[PDB]
Design a protein around this ligand. Structure first.
Ligand code: 0SI
Lengths: 194, 197
């Protein structure tokens, strides 16, 4: 379990509210304010989910072997409604749970501004919006299309050797879709208002 | 990786043909023939998939920690069409690819207690050469309840704690004959049985 996690008194799940003005809070706030400087941040929480982390780190080590090194990880955004936050904190992102034009997977945005749309980060009865900062194993990617249930093969002659993720645009991606459970770790939860 | 496996010389995947007369072949043949005595086995292959094994064993250790000294794993059957065998061997069981079962207890991957269920042509579709295909699968059934057709995840154990889930669902808790799982890496395809009429 990572150094920068704080002690969990022998528990396997906790949400840790970050201290404003310290290096970690500042780093996550800056990633958000790059595109959402007009929004008000109420708090940022570190998600310490030992089991999700374990499963994710196994998939990362596999993808690092499969892709023969390569930086396979990106930090992306995911807006969610308040009613889904408890499920995501405990279980992560589930493709079985908006437009799915690039495939039937879980969608992650490059820009917080995209995830900040009310269609994704639905304001709750108090006006509070929720967005995750997510470690995503995007790996080697290709353009997606409607109706994919997995990424396409890297070569149709070997139909089981797949891309890791798909995107809207390979040259200048703004969203990524992953189709498997172990490929996204929700690292921080931002609670904010318009 | 398990010490019983063949040396794969740094490779991540192999199918190993078992020999009749070995305990390993004979136990699977007996488990199959208990309910499929009218069919004949062509061959039994051990599936050695390092990455699927690693991810499955992590989920088993997690369920063993979470559950109270429960036997979380059952050895179950899953009938497949020939076209799906290469994908399952490499990538396991994807709920997003699953057919609607004739009796639905949820939108997940189905596994049978009895080989006779998986041996139905609806599940183990005979290929162009009359070969039928069935996996023998380690499944993390964990703590289970009777399923229902609307489910896309297992139900909560307690309605006032919606995130604390059953591990799987079944058709009948007192006499389970099928299990449904809703997550990746909850089922490891261990053997492939090729068989004919
Ligand atoms: O942050 C997100 N949260 C959620 S919750 C349910 C969906 C999303 C989501 C979807 C996103 O792309 C969708 C799309 C598809 C085709 C063309 C343009 C856009 C992008 C981001 C999100």
């Amino acid at each position: 379990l990572p150094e920068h996690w704080t002690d969990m008194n022998h528990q396997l799940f906790c949400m840790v509210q970050l201290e404003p003005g310290q290096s970690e809070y500042n780093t996550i706030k800056d990633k958000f304010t790059r595109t959402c400087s007009s929004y008000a941040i109420e708090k940022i929480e570190r998600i310490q989910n030992a089991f999700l982390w374990q499963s994710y780190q196994v998939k990362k080590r596999q993808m690092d072997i499969k892709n023969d090194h390569k930086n396979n990880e990106r930090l992306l955004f995911h807006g969610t409604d308040a009613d889904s936050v408890p499920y995501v904190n405990q279980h992560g992102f589930n493709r079985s749970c908006n437009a799915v034009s690039y495939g039937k997977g879980t969608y992650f945005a490059v820009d917080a501004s995209y995830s900040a749309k009310d269609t994704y980060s639905k304001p709750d009865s108090n006006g509070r919006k929720h967005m995750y900062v997510v470690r995503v194993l995007t790996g080697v990617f290709t353009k997606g299309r409607a109706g994919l249930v997995t990424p396409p093969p890297k070569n149709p002659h070997n139909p089981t050797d797949l891309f890791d993720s798909v995107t809207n645009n390979t040259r200048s991606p703004k969203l990524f879709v992953v189709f498997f459970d172990n490929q996204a770790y929700p690292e921080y939860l931002i609670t904010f208002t318009a």
